[PDB]
């Protein structure tokens, strides 16, 4: 049963959460091939495990930059959570370690690239295409929320496409285990729920708002609230007004009105029936939730992978030498990593 499945999932998660894996590899066990993505304090590189020849995506975080940007706790969150979870649509954390200068998280490689890249290129997804992806996010948030985890950075840039055309969620940088409410202003402007912006405390319901933004962006080709500057975006978000493209179906608009709901006592995912209000909505009437979970549904498209280390579905990035100092930096701050 569902209850039995989630109970076991929590048991598995709590053991690893209370006793996190630590120092399970070394940098010299990998050959660095190419940068797959970048951030303010690090990058993700395609690497090859020289022993097994397996390819991975290694996130490399500069410890000094993390400290400078006040992301210590968020980074500890990311690693502790990601090593503890297990779900078909979550990227797997295979190894983690640190050296004098950097933190390392060696993750499952997703050769299909980011959803963002495909969405921007083709313009928008059809509703069935968008629904297929949305269903996987609904199940992923059901899983995460049951563990008292809020994800807090949903967007196409953070959704990887695997070899089967299914999603793998990555970037747990803002993920947090919280039972009550929290207050950190973090996320991406286009995807912030009103309650985050109005600085009044918030909960897992911000993830369901973000799901609304994502479905809108997938189906429209642009997000529901955009402008040149974040301040203008925030004003639109809190307004309680959304405009829909004329090609949006009636069912899609009704769903989005209930996800992009400013009032928490009315937002889908946050009512008495929980995620079931979403799952049972007419827009998802054709969705076989069990088949989605079992990966038995044919994907809208599969990325052609002409090799285990093919990166043709990724943009090219400025490469930089991985510098490791002869002196240990920020030792105390990252002790538990």
């Amino acid at each position: 049963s569902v209850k039995e499945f989630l109970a076991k999932a929590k048991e598995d998660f709590l053991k690893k959460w209370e006793n996190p894996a630590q120092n399970t590899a070394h940098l010299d066990q990998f050959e660095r091939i190419k940068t797959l993505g970048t951030g303010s304090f690090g990058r993700v590189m395609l690497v090859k495990h020289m022993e097994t020849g397996n390819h991975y995506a290694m996130k490399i975080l500069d410890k000094q930059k993390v400290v400078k940007l006040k992301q210590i706790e968020h980074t500890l969150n990311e690693k502790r959570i990601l090593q503890a979870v297990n779900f078909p649509f979550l990227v797997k954390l295979e190894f983690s370690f640190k050296d004098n200068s950097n933190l390392y998280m060696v993750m499952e490689y997703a050769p299909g690239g980011e959803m963002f890249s495909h969405l921007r290129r083709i313009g928008r997804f059809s509703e069935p295409h968008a629904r297929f992806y949305a269903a996987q996010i609904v199940l992923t948030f059901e899983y995460l929320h049951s563990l008292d985890l809020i994800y807090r950075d949903l967007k196409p840039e953070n959704l990887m496409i695997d070899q089967q055309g299914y999603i793998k969620v990555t970037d747990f940088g803002f993920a947090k285990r919280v039972k009550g409410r929290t207050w950190t202003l973090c996320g991406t402007p286009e995807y912030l729920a009103p309650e985050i912006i109005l600085s009044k405390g918030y909960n897992k319901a911000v993830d369901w708002w973000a799901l609304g933004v994502l479905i809108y962006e997938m189906a429209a080709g642009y997000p529901p609230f955009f402008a040149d500057q974040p301040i203008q975006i925030y004003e639109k978000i809190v307004s309680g007004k959304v405009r829909f493209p004329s090609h949006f179906s009636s069912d899609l608009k009704d769903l989005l009105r209930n996800l992009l709901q400013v009032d928490l006592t009315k937002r889908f995912g946050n009512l008495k029936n929980g995620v079931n209000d979403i799952k049972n909505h007419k827009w998802f009437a054709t969705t076989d939730w069990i088949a989605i979970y079992q990966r038995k549904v044919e994907a809208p498209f599969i990325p052609k992978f002409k090799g285990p280390g093919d990166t043709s579905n990724f943009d090219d990035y400025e490469e930089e030498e991985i510098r490791v100092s002869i002196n240990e930096k920020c030792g105390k701050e990252f002790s538990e990593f």
């Binding site: 967007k155 940088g173 973090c186 991406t188 402007p189 429209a220 080709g221 955009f226 040149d228 974040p230």
Partner: peptide, 20 residues
Amino acid sequence: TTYADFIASGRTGRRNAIHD
């Protein structure tokens, strides 16, 4: 069009997170 306004905007590229 809204699509046209989006594409002419400065936020069609990868969006940075804020924190904060």
